[PDB]
Design goal:
It is classed as electron transport. The structure is a homodimer of 128-residue chains. Chain A is an alpha/beta fold and 128 residues long. Chain A has two helices and eight strands, in the order βββαβαββββ. The longest helix of chain A has 14 residues. Chain A is globular. The interface between A and B is medium-sized, with 13 and 13 residues. The structure holds copper (II) ion (2 copies). One copper (II) ion binds next to loops of chain B.
C-alpha cells in the first residue's frame, strides 16, 4: 500500500533519513520534500534528486554549473530519475515517478545538488 | 543463480566493478578478490569489506587505528558482514558469507579500509 515517503532537509545540511525503500507493489512512488529550517533558498536551499549511484557525481557536478536560478540541476539531465524544485525554509515540493524507472539490480542514491550539500545530504534508495 | 563475484582492486585504487547484486536464490555468496596491480601491500593493499551503508563510516574509522599489521580493520567488528584479508600485487583472497546476513530492502556497501582508499573504492551491494 505505502508508495510515498516524507523527507526533510534542515539548516544543518542533514536529511532526516538516508535510506528510502520502494515497495515493488508500487507502480508510482512519491517523495514529499519539506524544509523545516529558517534559512532561505540562497543560503540553505535543498532539492531531492534521485539517480543511479554511478550517475550521482556527474549530476552533482553539472548541477553546480547550472546555478541557483536553475535549482543547481542541468536542464533535461537524462541521468535524473526524479527531482524536486530547490526549496527554502517553510517550503515543500513533491515528485512522483514511475517505479518502472528503477531497474532491479541497479543501486540508487538521492542527494541535494546545492553546492557542497551532497557530501552530507546523500542517501540510498532500494526496492523491497 | 551466480552465487559468487570476482572483484579486482588495482594500482589506481579502482574496483573493476562498483555494483554487486546478490540473487535471493543464493543461500551463500562468495567474493573472490584479486590484486591485478604491481604495488605491494604496504603501498596499495586492498581488502573487500561488506557492511550496511550506515556502518561503513564507523568500520573505516575504527579500521585506521588497527594499522597495516591488522589489515586496517577493527578485530571482531560485528558491523562487518564479510571481509577478505588485505592483499598486495598478485595475491588473491575469497570470502563466503550467508545471504541471510543481507535484508531485501537494506543498502550495503563494500569498500577497502586501507586509509584513503574508501573515497575511490566504495561500491553498492543489494539483495535482488
Ligand atoms: Cu541542500
Ligand atoms: Cu585498497
Amino acid at each position: 500500500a505505502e508508495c510515498s515517503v516524507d523527507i526533510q532537509g534542515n539548516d544543518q545540511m542533514q536529511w532526516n533519513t538516508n535510506a528510502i525503500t520502494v515497495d515493488k507493489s508500487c507502480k508510482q512512488f512519491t517523495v514529499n520534500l519539506s524544509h523545516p529550517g529558517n534559512l532561505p533558498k540562497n543560503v540553505m536551499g535543498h532539492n531531492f534528486v534521485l539517480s543511479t549511484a554511478a550517475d550521482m557525481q556527474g549530476v552533482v557536478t553539472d548541477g553546480m554549473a547550472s546555478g541557483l536560478d536553475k535549482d543547481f540541476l542541468k536542464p533535461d539531465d537524462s541521468r535524473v530519475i526524479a527531482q524536486t524544485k530547490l526549496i527554502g525554509s517553510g517550503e515543500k515540493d513533491s515528485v512522483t515517478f514511475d517505479v518502472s524507472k528503477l531497474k532491479e539490480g541497479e543501486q540508487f542514491m538521492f542527494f541535494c545538488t546545492f553546492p557542497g550539500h551532497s557530501a552530507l545530504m546523500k542517501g540510498h534508495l532500494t526496492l523491497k
